[PDB]
Symmetry: D2
Subunit: 387 residues, 4 copies
């Protein structure tokens, strides 16, 4: 009873199911997929849409005439299936010209080329109906301390994004930008390494309302961070424009496992948050079917992403609806956390002797928080052991 | 030739050299230090000032009459030595009443008490001449996913800091706030876990100009992050109000080793940045002399903090002054990174055929970055092997 | 369901439910428990038995007559409840004399005292019926590289365990030793940091048959290692004498969460392994009820340890019993992994042209492993989504 | 100074300086190197010798006659330069047939092929003068818990190494095996993930004397472990047959930076240990010149490997030779750590009242270890600040 449909807003990158399995120590294990084949197979699995890098759809170096042909066959598969393109991005990391970055390469001419490559694909994305344009600065960074003056690099990064915002404003495009953070890999350290750093950077752009974040489960977990907490901060700031769902087993290389794999309880709390907060954007899977798998395994992995989301959504809803959980939340004073600390104001607080001079600190210290009972109720619901 | 003097602006917390050595598995190994003794011994070592938590100087629960006596002896040691108090902070983490937080405790009455405790110590800090008031939210967080609604918690955190800003504004105090991030410990996950998250949070406060960050070497390194990069972002934002220097060996418990220990090359690049950028604030050591040490070892550890900074400052200056390094920086195009990408503007960039239509991507891709020669010159300077 | 009974062999350390909640940054939040109370409360929850450090039972420094009194009360509570004592250990880490270690302290007189303290408690352990004596060398290690010659320290460690083995054999005691590894905390690096290092060390003892490992879920995960894989290697070597179950969220301080929390899927695969291998020793919980909790929360946390084991045991049994899973294990060739590679022998392999000269490597390379289907079946079973 | 010469025993893999720069997210940035060119360039830099995978030298799939041709050219370059081949290994990880492992692939026919591929290259290695044959099981492992029965996989791993040992003994080859551990990447978890796990596994082989370890700096650091401590345990066991030197910044993807980069103080203590223990095997660099570099940068990186070893060797020798350091080692009682704990024997220890009944634990507890003074002396020596 966990069948996905387009209403679930599940999306997949062309580069995900299309990943050929080349890793840093190994050759490809699967043939390349025709973008049109991926569109059709994903439609049959119940996906709502696809996403792409420019270079996933149009082979690097194509003439404008070849470019038009690739875009035409792709659009003809979209129209035939009803599939949507909610997000696009630029590949500024594969070609050797980007070995030191795109927007923050030390060479000025490479930075200008990176901007021209990006702008060209923004035109295409808006044409196909994308609402979000993602930037993953995978090559913006350094292996060594002297190679990059980070204040100058952030000036250049701000310059690039300001120019992109000027471009979409002057064209009158309805599209927003989302920065995808990652702490490391393929560079030793990547600029804007977490959701927090990206959120802070946006506030210094000329038009901050145009920019948000596209956090990825695995990337925050590569810094050991709590992904639901980071998503909560992004929602609190009004900046969760898109999200990348997958799996990661802790601090190591970027695994991009299927969603649900990796940290299972973190996935449960993530789904609880997105659904409770009314997140209405795409549920996008930036994952890689392991290279052990043939093409049947590729489609099983993709179907598993969607299935695990739906199972967790049902368990999260049951948790929140259970009156015993409702009572546990009161016992742990989750409702008091929603109450203003001092809506009576500063003067009243300073005059309030029960807040300090007469506060029974030891009685307050003796109150248990009852967090373990609440968390075991959450366990039981996740495991389907309520009964 | 590495003797510290007050001009080096080295400061120490009372809780650092005063750490008695109680750890999660062990009893104290050293007697408590009288604050007056620490002031005098640190003055003799060449320190510029001390910092304190309220509860380091005034034992928790003291009457206002006892409070005045503790403050009076302390001020009499400050006046006798010329020692400064550039920073103070509140202890909102030791007493059991704070077991679920201060500003974001689920219980509303604890949040009101935490604010009253903080405001009382702001008065004292301004009286003693502190320029910066630090907040380390060590207990703001959770071990389990249901225990804390993080959007509500951030509402409460914003409320607390807004009220503190209203208080200092209405009193006309010349003091600024600095948030000290930490990703975890003693809570399973701490709110505002990195420099980035804290920078982003500040931008949503009512008076953001009043607030900056107090990053700590070890804390960013507990998330595997590059501390010089994070400091560079804070400087770029204009938000580096204070800094905590110490040592950490990677991702594990918060070690608070003496500065220079832990990640030595990261310390070299940190000093290079602070000195090149003209950071003029305190060089504050938030460290703990290991509990293996007696009191001689405590003062050797503190002296070592200051010594390692001065050695690294000399090596960093020699690196930047070396004409061979100056040439290597040009060879790696660090100067081009300082140049605007497109100060000719968007229209000109779009019309510039050399930036895309006629860009020789393969010639540009063949250019080496010469980063390894530069980094070995940096190695040689750090090791004093230039000759 | 999921009610624990004594046959389930669940055990708890006195120091687990007895943890008063003091951590590196905070005071105790709970009063101390009488060991007699812990025995009776744990019996009521359905535990099989209790374990202890010498210092958990007999306050450090007690006279021989005060000692006998505390032992008397404890034994009475055991006799009244039928509760077992399957394991005991020595506290060689809390008292300041052990600040540089016990068995490997640089000071020779401390090492001799450590051995005498341990031997005294071995006698007590055998009296109470313990079959395993655990050693956690929590202070054996260093913060700095010069402080410890690790070759000499391993000589001292081997000497200590060799002397202990000579003592138990000369007494005719039925008791085996188990080393509990941990990578760090409270020392910067701890000797024998993982299951593997401990297994290697045992092979150099004079009587290796007397020694095995006591691995702990959270400790191996503090090095980012796969705990089921490590337990498999210990079982393969015949050295899994005992196990410590708890939860841990990745690489950070030692959290000691209740079992099932932390990494839930790793908990599932661990229980699958222990049950399918027929491990018949204690299921011991080395955990700390979070300091947010009162005593009701302490007992809810302990009961949750046992509940989560029983739920996971049911799910793993259902996984293995599922004919569809048995078919997927065959599709992924798990049964071929148990076939010897070359039971026909070295000469036959060298002459077998189908193993090289005529091996179709491209046809072999194209076979999918079908691991993703198998893993989604395991996911469905864990979540109770089969049926 | 710091000019390397052949007596320094520096060696390099063909695959190190030959790395073309392809990573999981990018194409090659450098052309392929002729192995004959690498031999001659490395000889000019002062290297002692080269190492190789079979597939580095002979393109995979080559006929027997094409094979002999490539070997011929290589041997000519060795004869012309005097360059040694102290070590060789098998590539069991690049070709897609090895996607589930070589020795522990689930498919039995792949395991047999893996053994034949290895045996063919052992013959070549012995011809060229290799004394050590290295095995890095980079594909032995799993991404998911059900995909591999680790007990059966360890049986298959033991079978393979037992067959290899039978082959070399039946041929009368003078060659020993060394296992290279790695915790993860490219598999989610790799079997025998650390030095300790590998040492334990060797003790269960039929001919343990034939097998040792080839530890790599970066791999142990990828588990957050102390690499000098691990090397000390391997030396203590008589199993350090070979070593891989490089640099790594903490827990993340396998960086393979040049030696000295990464964790500089750990590099210092490593060199101190190897030189003071008299390790006389190859100083092998398993590193990757960053893909930002052209071929000038490739040779600068390789030369930097050797330079940094020689600088650190000089500093550690000066540290150990310093009378003031010798006095500090005595103050910290390093000499007492080498004294047997109880050479008077078990009976004497039990009767010695000064070891327990009359031991002044409080006086012992008050002794400082003086570790911070000793470590600052080591810091001064590393930085060249003594004198
Ligand atoms: Mg992504
Ligand atoms: Mg601090
Ligand atoms: Mg334990
Ligand atoms: Mg290697
Ligand atoms: Mn990823
Ligand atoms: Mn700290
Ligand atoms: Mn633990
Ligand atoms: Mn490596």
């Amino acid at each position: 009873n966990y069948q996905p449909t387009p209403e679930d807003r599940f999306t997949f990158g062309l580069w995900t199911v299309g990943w050929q399995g080349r890793d840093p120590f190994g050759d490809a294990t699967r043939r390349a997929l025709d973008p049109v084949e991926s569109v059709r197979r994903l439609a049959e699995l119940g996906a709502h849409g696809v996403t792409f890098h420019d270079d996933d759809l149009i082979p690097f170096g194509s003439s404008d005439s070849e470019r038009e042909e690739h875009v035409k066959r792709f659009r003809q598969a979209l129209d035939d299936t009803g599939m949507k393109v909610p997000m696009a991005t630029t590949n500024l990391f594969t070609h050797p010209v980007f070995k030191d970055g795109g927007f923050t390469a030390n060479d000025r001419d490479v930075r200008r080329y990176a901007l021209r490559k990006t702008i060209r694909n923004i035109d295409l994305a808006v044409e196909l109906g994308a609402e979000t344009y993602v930037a993953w600065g995978g090559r913006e960074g350094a292996e060594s301390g002297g190679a990059k003056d980070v204040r100058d690099a952030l000036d250049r990064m701000k310059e690039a994004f300001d120019l992109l915002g000027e471009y979409v404003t002057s064209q009158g495009y309805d599209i927003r930008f989302a920065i995808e953070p990652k702490p490391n890999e393929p560079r030793g350290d990547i600029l804007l390494p977490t959701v927090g750093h990206a959120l802070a950077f946006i506030e210094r752009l000329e038009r901050p309302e145009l920019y948000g974040v596209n956090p990825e489960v695995g990337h925050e977990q590569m810094a050991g961070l709590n992904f639901p907490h980071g998503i909560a901060q992004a929602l609190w700031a009004g900046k969760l424009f898109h999200i990348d769902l997958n799996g990661q087993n802790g601090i190591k290389y970027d695994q991009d496992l299927r969603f649900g794999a990796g940290d299972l309880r973190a996935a449960f709390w993530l789904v609880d948050l997105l659904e409770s907060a009314g997140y209405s954007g795409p549920r996008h899977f930036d994952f890689k079917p392991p290279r052990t798998e043939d093409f049947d395994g590729v489609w099983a992995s993709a179907a598993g992403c969607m299935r695990n989301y739906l199972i967790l959504k049902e368990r999260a809803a049951a948790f929140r609806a259970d009156p015993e959980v409702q009572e546990a939340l009161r016992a742990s004073r989750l409702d008091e956390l929603a109450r203003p600390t001092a809506a009576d104001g500063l003067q009243a607080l300073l005059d309030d002797r029960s807040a300090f001079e007469e506060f029974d600190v030891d009685a307050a210290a003796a109150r248990g928080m009852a967090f373990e009972r609440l968390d075991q109720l959450a366990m039981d619901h996740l495991l389907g052991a309520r009964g």
